[PDB]
Design a protein around this ligand. Structure first.
Ligand SMILES: Nc1ncnc2c1ncn2[C@@H]1O[C@H](COP(=O)(O)OP(=O)(O)OP(=O)(O)O)[C@@H](O)[C@H]1O
Ligand SMILES: Nc1ncnc2c1ncn2[C@@H]1O[C@H](COP(=O)(O)OP(=O)(O)OP(=O)(O)O)[C@@H](O)[C@H]1O
Ligand SMILES: [Mg+2]
Ligand SMILES: [Mg+2]
Lengths: 452, 17, 466
């Protein structure tokens, strides 16, 4: 006996039920074999040529997939959206009408019958990370002891005395903006302060968010991403550890997403544990709306030029594990540590000397005054890393040609000369943190700059 | 900073039925 | 004799089977000849007017091709995504449930039937963007040794000596940019690198050197623009997992990945490119090289230590570089008129070297006719520019081509075979006068260099002509 199928729609007291069959709804009788009371909403039933429901099957396992939007007040209907961004109200099946369905879940549905039968499991990885543990301690930075004390007073101090700060009738600041030259780190400070906060709170969640990747310009979708990020931040704030939301290169952003971000930050205003920290290369490109007193109240400037910090960074980069030439140790009788320290001192003095090789900038002032900037200025950790890598490349060349291993002074000198020849360019030495720095240093405005 | 007009470029959309 | 068809779905204890036929899902009883035990899910069956399973077929090889996303927990259903993101759960066929099933595979599927039957592989994307360039080697490039040495260090050395790099804990350069005035030989360096990579791969024994122009990876549809770059990077990662070096060449990076602020989708390509480059940094064999005339128009974000750590500038050739280029072009195999051989006793090499020296001296001399432009400064005195300040390898090649054309004209008219020195001598002045009116030779980089040298902004330029 060839038998068809249909979808049960409603159950009535007259032992006649509505069935969606062949794409149309029909009121049809039920055979005595099946019990009308036992039947459930959305259950798949079987019929015959005489159109009699002989038995009930199982809820369908295939069909369209829709994203849930909301649930109707009656509790029996739910508004969902399909792949074509079309919104439809579908009656929830018996197993669906703990777990309570929430907006954003994917549901199996047949639009012809308009019934949602099952909830499909989903796996998300982008939002699942939720945890990054920085490994950069304060030992990774050098010549910044005053800055470290300042940031301890800025962020570490209020947390140790939250009760006193609150009873002193002053609201705490929750926003720290680290600004400075792009070449300098300005981000490892965030790792260091996160580590210090984790150590002092006595595992620690540090959320790094990149500005360029957050851009979902197409249709206001970056606002959705920001809302989801702040919701996850609140979720982590439920757990009893401070949560830091870090933004990198905020100048990539900012009528726009600024009001959405401001509202989201105001949402987490009551979260004392959660601190929003941002790092932006372009101070001027920062929207003043976020620069008002309040949320991003704390602003800290990082300054690159100093001899002691550069020497400490160079010492940090040149670890003991690097091979050292036998001729270098001949003057020190195998005392590798002293030889390396002397090498660092010599290369730092060569870099931070005022000679003809340090004619990096020939800057002319408006009144007609001229000055020469040496290799001491425009020095940052990134360029020191470049110097170290170039010196390693030159040392590999020397090993592959002469045969004797080790790192020599001429390698460092050649690396410095080559990297300053390459970096002697306007795009990397652009307007930010340069014109203002020299204006504050010399004391006069500058209208034109010449290079060599 | 002279004000300037604009000309947009449409992106095709995929629609079935 | 006329019999229909249907798709089997499942078997039941009552020897009845579910069949999908003409959009109708039914339950049917098989014929006594056909045993329901041997039947399997997804197999096509033959029906009749009485709707009786009279024969069992095979799995059909037609329908839509969809991308597999995941396998459901039961192990018999899979969630896949269609062409227009029509995500759907479909039962897997018996052959599907070595090769094991993996996410991202292309599967045959009928949405009406709701079943997936077979897997079809497609990995020909790299062949679409594959570009082959033979007949170029580092020997052909003349006047560029420092840049050639640097690019060899940035590509050849890390792959040749991995142990040395791991010994000193030095990260191999991941991004190399080439920039300079037009015609200085950036594309020549790129194609020489491609040919060397092809030679190395043939020695190992090609497709690994992928080359793409900017505007190539732009699509009119709202989607599929990210998909192209995603597939490119996945193919690059697969080639890296093969172990051979792979180089992706973004030619003319001014078209795309420019600065974000300038505008009047280009907004989304650069961020996902940065994400992909950061995610591929683990693979040592993936190297991204891009050439650009307008280095300033590119976004400074990518031009940072890290992704694009290595920058190379190719400047206009000087006298010695011009001599090297002429030596590369003026070979001894070209015919030479007996007049020039008479003074050198038939020694082709010495005669050609002397001719090259003479022509280089001619085209680099500060003669009156070689004055090209009159730079005007607000305060300082005006400056006279020469043709030597805008020299390029392309100009030398065109001069040689014009001289050869004049030689062909001579051998056609007077019948005297060979190449005369006067051919080069007057081709020089012809080429110089041809580009006199056009200030096209000037570039923003050239103007920046000139402004930084004299110390005043350029105010006016005048084309000197007699
Ligand atoms: N103590 C230090 N001070 C400065 N720079 C350092 C220090 N230690 C390491 N660096 C180097 O500085 C480089 C850049 O660091 P970082 O990414 O924090 O700078 P950034 O300002 O974020 O750059 P961008 O804004 O372009 O992303 C790193 O590659 C790192 O190797
Ligand atoms: N050593 C050399 N230096 C410069 N040009 C050369 C050299 N040898 C040959 N040429 C010639 O220069 C011409 C242009 O070279 P190429 O195509 O590399 O420039 P390009 O990188 O395309 O410049 P752009 O990208 O600005 O157009 C080639 O046709 C080649 O024949
Ligand atoms: Mg930073
Ligand atoms: Mg080119």
């Amino acid at each position: 006996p060839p038998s068809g199928y249909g979808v049960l729609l409603a159950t009535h007291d007259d032992d006649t039920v509505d069935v969606f069959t062949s794409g149309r709804k029909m009121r049809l009788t039920c055979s005595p074999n099946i019990d009308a009371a036992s039947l459930k909403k959305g259950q798949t039933v079987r019929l015959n040529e005489a159109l009699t429901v002989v038995e009930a099957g199982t809820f369908e396992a295939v069909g369209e997939i829709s994203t849930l939007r909301e649930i109707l007040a009656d509790g029996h209907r739910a508004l969902v959206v399909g792949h074509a961004d079309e919104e439809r109200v579908v009656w929830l099946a018996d197993p669906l009408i703990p777990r309570k369905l929430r907006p954003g879940d994917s549901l199996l549905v047949d639009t012809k019958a308009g019934y949602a039968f099952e909830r499909i499991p989903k796996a998300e990885v982008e939002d699942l990370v939720l945890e990054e543990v920085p490994d950069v301690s304060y030992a990774d930075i050098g010549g910044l002891s005053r800055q470290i004390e300042q940031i301890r007073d800025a962020v570490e101090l209020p947390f140790l005395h939250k009760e006193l700060y609150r009873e002193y009738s002053l609201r705490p600041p929750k926003g720290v903006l680290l600004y400075g030259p792009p070449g300098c780190g300005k981000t490892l400070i965030a790792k260091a302060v996160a580590n210090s906060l984790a150590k002092k709170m006595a595992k620690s969640y540090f959320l790094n968010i990149k500005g360029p990747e957050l851009l979902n310009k197409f249709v206001g979708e970056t606002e959705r991403h920001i809302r989801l990020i702040f919701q996850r931040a609140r979720e982590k704030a439920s757990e009893g550890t401070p949560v830091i939301v870090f933004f990198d290169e905020m100048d990539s952003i900012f009528t726009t997403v600024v009001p959405q971000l401001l509202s989201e930050i105001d949402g987490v205003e009551g979260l004392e544990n959660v601190i929003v920290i941002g790092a932006s290369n372009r101070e001027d490109m920062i929207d003043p709306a976020i620069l008002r007193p309040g949320r991003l109240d704390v602003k800290i400037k990082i300054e690159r030029p100093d001899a002691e910090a550069a020497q400490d960074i160079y010492s940090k980069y040149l670890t003991e594990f690097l091979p050292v030439h036998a001729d270098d140790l001949a003057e020190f009788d195998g005392d590798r540590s002293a030889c390396i320290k002397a090498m660092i001192e010599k290369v730092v003095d060569r870099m931070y000397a005022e000679i003809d090789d340090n004619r990096f900038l020939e800057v002319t002032y408006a009144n007609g005054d001229k000055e020469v900037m040496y290799f001491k200025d425009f020095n940052s950790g990134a360029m020191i890393q470049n110097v170290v890598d170039r010196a390693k490349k030159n040392a590999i060349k020397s090993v592959l040609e002469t045969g004797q291993p080790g790192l020599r002074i001429q390698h460092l000198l050649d690396s410095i000369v080559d990297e300053f020849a390459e970096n002697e360019d306007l795009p990397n030495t652009t307007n930010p943190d340069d014109w203002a720095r020299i204006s504050g240093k010399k004391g006069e405005r500058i209208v034109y700059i010449r290079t060599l | 900073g002279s004000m300037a007009q604009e000309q947009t470029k449409r992106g095709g959309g995929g629609g079935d039925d």
